[PDB]
Design an enzyme around this catalytic site. Structure first.
Site, short mmCIF file in Angstrom:
data_model
loop_
_atom_site.label_atom_id
_atom_site.label_comp_id
_atom_site.label_asym_id
_atom_site.label_seq_id
_atom_site.Cartn_x
_atom_site.Cartn_y
_atom_site.Cartn_z
N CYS A 196 -65.87 -18.14 -22.06
CA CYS A 196 -66.67 -19.27 -22.57
C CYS A 196 -66.63 -19.44 -24.10
O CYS A 196 -67.00 -18.53 -24.84
CB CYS A 196 -68.12 -19.12 -22.14
SG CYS A 196 -69.14 -20.41 -22.86
N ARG A 208 -70.41 -20.18 -26.33
CA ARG A 208 -71.41 -19.13 -26.41
C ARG A 208 -72.28 -19.05 -27.65
O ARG A 208 -73.16 -18.20 -27.72
CB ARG A 208 -70.76 -17.76 -26.16
CG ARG A 208 -70.54 -17.44 -24.70
CD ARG A 208 -69.94 -16.07 -24.55
NE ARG A 208 -68.51 -16.06 -24.87
CZ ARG A 208 -67.80 -14.95 -25.05
NH1 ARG A 208 -68.38 -13.76 -24.95
NH2 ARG A 208 -66.50 -15.03 -25.31
N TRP A 239 -72.19 -28.69 -21.94
CA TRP A 239 -71.69 -30.05 -22.12
C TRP A 239 -70.19 -29.92 -22.29
O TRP A 239 -69.69 -28.84 -22.57
CB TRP A 239 -72.31 -30.77 -23.32
CG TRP A 239 -72.35 -29.98 -24.58
CD1 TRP A 239 -71.31 -29.66 -25.39
CD2 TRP A 239 -73.51 -29.38 -25.16
NE1 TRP A 239 -71.74 -28.89 -26.45
CE2 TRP A 239 -73.10 -28.70 -26.33
CE3 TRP A 239 -74.87 -29.34 -24.80
CZ2 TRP A 239 -73.99 -28.00 -27.15
CZ3 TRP A 239 -75.76 -28.63 -25.62
CH2 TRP A 239 -75.31 -27.97 -26.78
C1 HEM Z 1 -73.54 -25.58 -24.24
C2 HEM Z 1 -72.22 -25.96 -24.11
C3 HEM Z 1 -71.14 -25.27 -23.53
C4 HEM Z 1 -69.82 -25.50 -23.85
C5 HEM Z 1 -69.27 -26.60 -24.75
C6 HEM Z 1 -68.99 -24.61 -23.06
C7 HEM Z 1 -67.59 -24.73 -22.94
C8 HEM Z 1 -66.75 -24.08 -22.03
C9 HEM Z 1 -65.32 -24.38 -21.80
C10 HEM Z 1 -64.44 -25.34 -22.60
C11 HEM Z 1 -64.90 -23.61 -20.74
C12 HEM Z 1 -63.53 -23.71 -20.07
C13 HEM Z 1 -63.63 -24.04 -18.58
C14 HEM Z 1 -62.27 -24.18 -17.92
O1 HEM Z 1 -61.25 -24.24 -18.65
O2 HEM Z 1 -62.22 -24.25 -16.68
C15 HEM Z 1 -66.09 -22.79 -20.37
C16 HEM Z 1 -66.10 -21.78 -19.42
C17 HEM Z 1 -67.18 -21.01 -19.05
N1 HEM Z 1 -68.46 -21.17 -19.53
FE1 HEM Z 1 -69.06 -22.33 -21.08
N2 HEM Z 1 -69.77 -23.83 -22.26
C18 HEM Z 1 -71.09 -24.23 -22.50
C19 HEM Z 1 -72.15 -23.73 -21.80
C20 HEM Z 1 -72.13 -22.75 -20.86
C21 HEM Z 1 -73.34 -22.28 -20.19
C22 HEM Z 1 -74.73 -22.91 -20.33
C23 HEM Z 1 -72.94 -21.20 -19.40
C24 HEM Z 1 -73.74 -20.40 -18.54
C25 HEM Z 1 -75.13 -20.39 -18.39
C26 HEM Z 1 -71.47 -21.08 -19.60
C27 HEM Z 1 -70.63 -20.25 -18.88
C28 HEM Z 1 -69.24 -20.26 -18.84
C29 HEM Z 1 -68.40 -19.48 -17.92
C30 HEM Z 1 -68.77 -18.31 -17.01
C31 HEM Z 1 -67.14 -19.95 -18.05
C32 HEM Z 1 -65.96 -19.46 -17.25
C33 HEM Z 1 -65.68 -20.43 -16.13
C34 HEM Z 1 -64.55 -19.97 -15.24
O3 HEM Z 1 -64.09 -18.82 -15.39
O4 HEM Z 1 -64.12 -20.76 -14.37
N3 HEM Z 1 -71.01 -22.03 -20.48
N4 HEM Z 1 -67.20 -23.12 -21.14
C1 LIG Z 2 -61.23 -29.76 -12.46
C2 LIG Z 2 -62.59 -30.43 -12.68
O1 LIG Z 2 -63.21 -29.69 -13.72
C3 LIG Z 2 -64.54 -29.77 -13.86
O2 LIG Z 2 -65.32 -30.46 -13.14
N1 LIG Z 2 -65.03 -29.04 -14.88
C4 LIG Z 2 -64.18 -28.21 -15.75
C5 LIG Z 2 -64.59 -26.77 -15.66
C6 LIG Z 2 -66.05 -26.56 -16.05
N2 LIG Z 2 -66.22 -26.94 -17.43
C7 LIG Z 2 -67.28 -26.64 -18.23
C8 LIG Z 2 -68.37 -25.86 -17.77
C9 LIG Z 2 -69.44 -25.60 -18.63
CL1 LIG Z 2 -70.77 -24.65 -18.07
C10 LIG Z 2 -69.46 -26.09 -19.94
C11 LIG Z 2 -68.37 -26.87 -20.40
N3 LIG Z 2 -67.28 -27.14 -19.55
C12 LIG Z 2 -66.92 -27.50 -15.18
C13 LIG Z 2 -66.46 -28.95 -15.24
#
Ligand code: HEM
Ligand SMILES: CCOC(=O)N1CCC(Nc2cc(Cl)ccn2)CC1
Ligand code: HEM
Ligand SMILES: CCCCCCCCO[C@@H]1O[C@H](CO)[C@@H](O)[C@H](O)[C@H]1O
Ligand SMILES: CCCCCCCCO[C@@H]1O[C@H](CO)[C@@H](O)[C@H](O)[C@H]1O
Ligand SMILES: CCOC(=O)N1CCC(Nc2cc(Cl)ccn2)CC1
Ligand SMILES: C[C@H](O)[C@H](O)[C@@H]1CNc2nc(N)[nH]c(=O)c2N1
Ligand SMILES: C[C@H](O)[C@H](O)[C@@H]1CNc2nc(N)[nH]c(=O)c2N1
Lengths: 413, 413
Positions: free
Chosen positions: A111, A114, A283
């Site tokens: 993430c 963070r 977001w």
């Molecule tokens: C507040 C704004 C936030 C932003 C801009 C952000 C942004 C991102 C981005 C760009 C990814 C990439 C996802 C992908 O490529 O599939 C990601 C993954 C992730 N985020 Fe964040 N995040 C935010 C909030 C959160 C919150 C609130 C949580 C948990 C309470 C969180 C938990 C995670 C986790 C666990 C992943 C890994 C997802 C996976 O492995 O499929 N994020 N986040």
């Molecule tokens: C392939 C479709 O992908 C999605 O719907 N996505 C992309 C993977 C996840 N992206 C996120 C999640 C979080 Cl919690 C914050 C910012 N981006 C959730 C939304």
């Protein structure tokens, strides 16, 4: 003693000690390695394993206060021990749960947002009992998080796993996602990546609308029972239509995307307890939509059409038309969200944010688990500072794990 | 039995068995991990270790023929064994050496141009003896490789390490590289990254020319003796001046770059033998210059100036001006090399090339050691196919290792 970490962009050196608290051919670019997957169970957590972890967590929690509360700490440690002997598990105080969710977020190596870790709304649905109640809870979450465009991070915690035979699970990867259709003429319509899951929904009764942007229904499983299908009320789904600040023909592309990025299928592990259902959201970061959703060839794959619209030599790779196209698409995405007043962050700003955060993390607790491969944006890698930063990737606890796709391990009733 | 590898862009599945032949907190984004560094010695290779590796290599070599030569194979195996008992080491036939260099290249996890692995010119300088002779050999290499713009891959193998006290070493990271100067006014001129090494050259007698693009001298060490400084004859250094196909003001930037990308400080490990001096080269991939050399903030850092020249909102990150700028710089680089008839490949074409190659590799020998972090271009990551490919990273043999910077482990005479 500690691992040395270097930032080849600033020469900065960091010492990682935090990794010492970690848990467990180099399996590097593996999307879903077993190390990040917390699977099913058909029996309670062996008390010999549970209590240690419980004690462990309780100590972390109480040690987190600027001014310790040793009386409560010891009392709590006892209360929990006794609670496990008598029940074979235990309940977290809302506070501990809140603390648990932020730390798990804080420990997500993949993430990049963070720096926002302490800003999280927690919805306690641990007392939930039916799919219908699940559905209502999810809607509350969606409504709250969407906040009419001014997105708010939030998480909804459902009942913790008991014996592993009564698992609450969301079968969807995300709360909001578009369906994919295998048309008669043999063409794919919508999100090519959700073809299978779309079929499942149909198989479970959902009526396919064969649109390019049809929001899939929630497929909820409660108390380990067969999953029920629930369409999401359209009023609840905010979307942004894509416009380019200069190419008026861009809108002619007829594209849009949902404003809420919510991960729905991950498990929250904390102090020995497991929560198979805890959807959460933050977001969007521009590149997710502009690059992955719209440009991946196995998704909406719009790169060539935008290339032509721009009049580029789409037939000559070395002309670098792809780089010209994707950037304009990224600009459209950012421009549209902003124009429509929906929270979104560009990847450049996101990267600097994370660097600031990682900096804070090493000072604060001597480390920050980071997965370089995921943290570096899908475009303009070395243009961002995260690219020049060496990173240590490890699994602490609390943590958010992947799970085995439910339809693969569910015994239908 | 084998590792499963997936390509999320095509769904393609591959089984990696090759990794079984590998050698030796997740140290992922570490530039120079100990695992990739083959350090010094002050004693010959323990025969107990050498012979096994020798036997090993000889078997690989002979097993590589479409139609085996068992007589020669056994004879060679014997010849080598006997040669080690009597001398405590051995010499590779030119053929084996040639074979060794291509395989080591073939096994470089961080090289994206490996589809060219079988096309390599090998210069045998194993009988070299003085720094001067080293210098002459290097010049021959440079001249041959440059081929007046039609670049040719080649490698020059110097004497193999004996006792570790008579090591042939090139102290330069690359054969051709620009100097970096800490000016009086406090500004840096030239390549900010070579500041230290530039100073060393001066310390060793080289006369600083305080230019923005001064080719550094070769700092050669022969038979383990102190390093001697040799300026490279200017006629031998081909350069490309940067022009943009549309922005006439681009040339006003007064930029250029050398046409020869030659790695000078790596060690070739093969069948138990080590070669501390084996400079090699291929041809450039556009992004190395256009992105890393020109846009890294700790290098020529020209991104903002190009931003302004283009009239972009260089003060607003979310405007994505950086993405617009770097692409035009990449275009200039490619355009200039092409215009001046100097071999170069764009990163898009390079990526597809590697994918084709990896495909060939799994079919051929059931694997292909790949370092995702290095193989994915510094810009437009997911726009390239290498980004969606899961990869296994392991160390086979022959192999090209990093070495400890010589000035750190050299006992001056
Ligand atoms: C507040 C704004 C936030 C932003 C801009 C952000 C942004 C991102 C981005 C760009 C990814 C990439 C996802 C992908 O490529 O599939 C990601 C993954 C992730 N985020 Fe964040 N995040 C935010 C909030 C959160 C919150 C609130 C949580 C948990 C309470 C969180 C938990 C995670 C986790 C666990 C992943 C890994 C997802 C996976 O492995 O499929 N994020 N986040
Ligand atoms: C392939 C479709 O992908 C999605 O719907 N996505 C992309 C993977 C996840 N992206 C996120 C999640 C979080 Cl919690 C914050 C910012 N981006 C959730 C939304
Ligand atoms: C024929 C054209 C070739 C191309 C286009 C190519 C391209 C590349 C690129 C883009 C890199 C990245 C370097 C960096 O980011 O610092 C690289 C690394 C590497 N290449 Fe190739 N290469 C070619 C030939 C060769 C040859 C001939 C050899 C060896 C005989 C080779 C060995 C390696 C090695 C070992 C690395 C790793 C360098 C390091 O770790 O610092 N390459 N190559
Ligand atoms: C297996 C049960 C072990 C119980 C030992 C508890 C020791 C109390 O641990 C204390 O917790 C405080 C937080 O309030 C910290 O500030 C203290 O530094 C810490 O020593
Ligand atoms: C320790 C010494 C072991 C010597 C055993 C040598 C066995 C010969 O090995 C043979 O080499 C051929 C290549 O010419 C291959 O084609 C054969 O498949 C292989 O069995
Ligand atoms: C920082 C200066 O970088 C260089 O001089 N470089 C970049 C790193 C190396 N690049 C290479 C090497 C080879 Cl062998 C083929 C293609 N590119 C050698 C040239
Ligand atoms: C195979 C490779 O790991 C995969 O395609 C990538 C890499 N890095 C990523 N990075 C992010 N943020 N999201 C992703 O889905 C991926 N997937
Ligand atoms: C820290 C990080 O590993 C480093 O800055 C990167 C990553 N990947 C790379 N990839 C290539 N091809 N060349 C490089 O120098 C680097 N360096």
């Amino acid at each position: 003693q500690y691992v040395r970490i270097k930032n080849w962009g600033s020469g900065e050196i960091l010492h990682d000690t935090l990794h010492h608290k970690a848990t467990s051919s180099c399996l590097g670019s593996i999307m879903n390695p077993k190390s990040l997957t917390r699977g099913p169970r058909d029996k309670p957590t062996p008390l010999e394993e549970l209590l240690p972890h419980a004690i462990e967590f309780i100590n972390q929690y109480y040690g987190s206060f600027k001014e310790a509360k040793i009386e409560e700490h010891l009392a709590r440690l006892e209360a929990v021990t006794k609670e496990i002997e008598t029940t074979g598990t235990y309940q977290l105080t809302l506070d501990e749960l809140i603390f648990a969710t932020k730390m798990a977020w804080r420990n997500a190596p993949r993430c990049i947002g963070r720096i926002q870790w302490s800003n999280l709304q927690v919805f306690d649905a641990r007392n939930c009992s039916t799919a219908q109640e699940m559905f209502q809870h999810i809607c509350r979450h969606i409504l709250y998080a969407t906040n009419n465009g001014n997105i708010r991070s939030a998480i909804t915690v459902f009942p913790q796993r008991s014996d592993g035979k009564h698992d609450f699970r969301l079968w969807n990867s995300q709360l909001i996602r578009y369906a994919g259709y295998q048309m008669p003429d043999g063409t794919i319509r919508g999100d090519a990546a959700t073809l299978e899951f779309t079929q499942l929904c149909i198989d479970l009764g959902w009526k396919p609308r064969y649109g390019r942007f049809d929001v899939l229904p929630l497929v909820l499983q409660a108390d380990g029972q067969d999953p029920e299908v629930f369409e999401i009320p359209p009023d609840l789904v905010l979307e942004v239509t894509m416009e380019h600040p200069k190419y008026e023909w861009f809108q002619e592309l007829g594209l849009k995307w949902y404003a809420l990025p919510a991960v729905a299928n991950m498990l929250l592990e904390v102090g020995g307890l497991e929560f198979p259902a805890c959807p959460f959201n933050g977001w969007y970061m521009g590149t997710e939509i502009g690059v992955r959703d719209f440009c991946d060839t196995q998704r909406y794959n719009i790169l060539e059409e935008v290339g032509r619209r721009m009049g580029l030599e789409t037939h000559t790779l070395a002309s670098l038309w792809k780089d010209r196209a994707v950037t304009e698409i990224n600009v459209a995405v950012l421009h549209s969200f902003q124009k429509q007043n929906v929270t979104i962050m560009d990847h450049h700003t996101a990267s600097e944010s994370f660097m600031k955060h990682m900096q804070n993390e090493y000072r604060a607790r001597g480390g920050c688990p980071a997965d370089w491969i995921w943290l570096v944006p899908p475009v303009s890698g070395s243009i961002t500072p995260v690219f020049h930063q060496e990173m240590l990737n490890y699994v602490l606890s609390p943590f958010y794990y992947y799970q085995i796709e439910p339809w693969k391990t569910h015994i239908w009733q």
